[PDB]
Amino acid sequence: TCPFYKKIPGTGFTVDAFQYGVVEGCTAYFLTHFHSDHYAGLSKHFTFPVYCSEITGNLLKNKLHVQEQYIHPLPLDTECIVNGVKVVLLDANHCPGAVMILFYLPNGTVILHTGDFRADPSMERSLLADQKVHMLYLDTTYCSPEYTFPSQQEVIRFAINTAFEAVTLNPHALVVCGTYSIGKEKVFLAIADVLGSKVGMSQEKYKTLQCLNIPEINSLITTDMCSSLVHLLPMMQINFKGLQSHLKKCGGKYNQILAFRPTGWTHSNKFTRIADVIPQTKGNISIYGIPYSEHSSYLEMKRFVQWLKPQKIIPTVNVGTWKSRSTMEKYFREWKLEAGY
Template identity: 60%
Template structure:
């Protein structure tokens, strides 16, 4: 066993060293993936069978959260219906191990009340509210994009959260980007204008295995057209049990001007070759690459978005993030006023943890001052 350290409220975790023969020790599940007072873990499949764990919770179907999960998994998995559909379809985990839970409905899991809340991340992504028999409430956000609508969630109304397991992907004031709907409206406006200017424009939208669907569905609704997807993408979208998917998604590229491609295929040469397959129906490409915040795409307002052009190919990198911006995260935390925060991202170094602790303390202090000012008024 390696060193142990106490951090953020005295939780203990370890850094394993190699075994006695020099072989690396098996990965140990870190404390921030375990729910105290239960035998539950969240997004901890990469650690194999965890001693003492009786229930494995999966917040959403992104690889960094289900990594390690295979068709040979033989333990109870709790998640949303959409995520369970995806796990069954893509990984082929047996039905008997999948336990889909409804949204916004308290469910008893081994004596713990568990409520799934929409996380505003990718389809099927949820936050888990664990309400323990001793009265403590623990909220695990999984990956999420905080939104003011979450402040109206009945389960969170008047709920005193003891521990918040927080998605801290962008927990730095430098991470500022537009609201999701602003970016969607921008993309829709650009697409509509392009088609009006040139009816032979082929619209392409990049996507991951799951995620960014709101962008291309909004464009489809605005243009009154269907969405052409690859067979693999359509199989994934079918897992959403969505009427919109059934109504709009097609495999026939000749049937619509809006196509969805993997992000890796949005390079100029790839798009040029793709266009050749649809001539003379189309003679130009307008592509959207929805990404989060990057140093090369650090725009705080849609007015600053600029396209890249190469002949008849135009590509817009749009700052459509499915993680909270710094200000959105701050507002959510100040709304909840948790007693304790455990960051679940970028928590691997003492320097990073200390920086986030300083930020959390600042938010807490500001929140208390605002509450006092409001009370005085």
């Protein structure tokens, strides 16, 4: 049964609610992005209207085989009427195709559903500037002040410089980047660009990348692994055992691996500056954990919410424990007292 924080009152709409069977009264199912916790339940046998971005729609059709007749892509930054209700999709600054959804309810209430997002000051100059929001359904993944991490630009600068240094010292080193979902493509694309290489990968991952509308993509990726010195592997293989095994497969073309694990936040963020980050090393294999986040830091979230000044906040993440719910409620009241709304 569908939880309350996935329902939009005064409509027939749900958000990210595909794992509950046929939801009573739902005439349109919105999907914010193509991550498995959010699409859980969709398949080629789904027969209700799905509303989403173009990129999410490419992934539904090619990866999940949802039939074309049930896919309803909407352009971004454009007022659209769905089943008699005005909606707008906004870039969420999460993974490719990820959106926030603004709903203009028939009774005059305005609701913003962030989906998953990385708040940014650029959102203060979207179509959000123009009017008031009564209810905010908020991605509260990192809603506590201990969650700090650098800008995505600083993280990419560290990765490019690290990879370029290593491969210039040793032209026989291979770079490996972990992946388990869409998102964070800049990590492997920026490293391959500095090295003058295409990114090599499995046929399954090439297919997924071909759905993302990235400009000039045919110039940047390949399924010919042996022509490429940046390879992608599943995240589960980014360990000394799995990397040793991978090094065998390249027929003695390489004699060193340098590997990246983009994580979200880890507790080594609470002590170490990005500049000071060091790898784990065993022999000719080194592994870097890099804090590349596609969710808001505490401070980014706080800034967004203090600017938007919503009347009510409904968290969408960390809602399962009383301690989490209490902590999040305390910070919302601080933010409101400090800013005066």
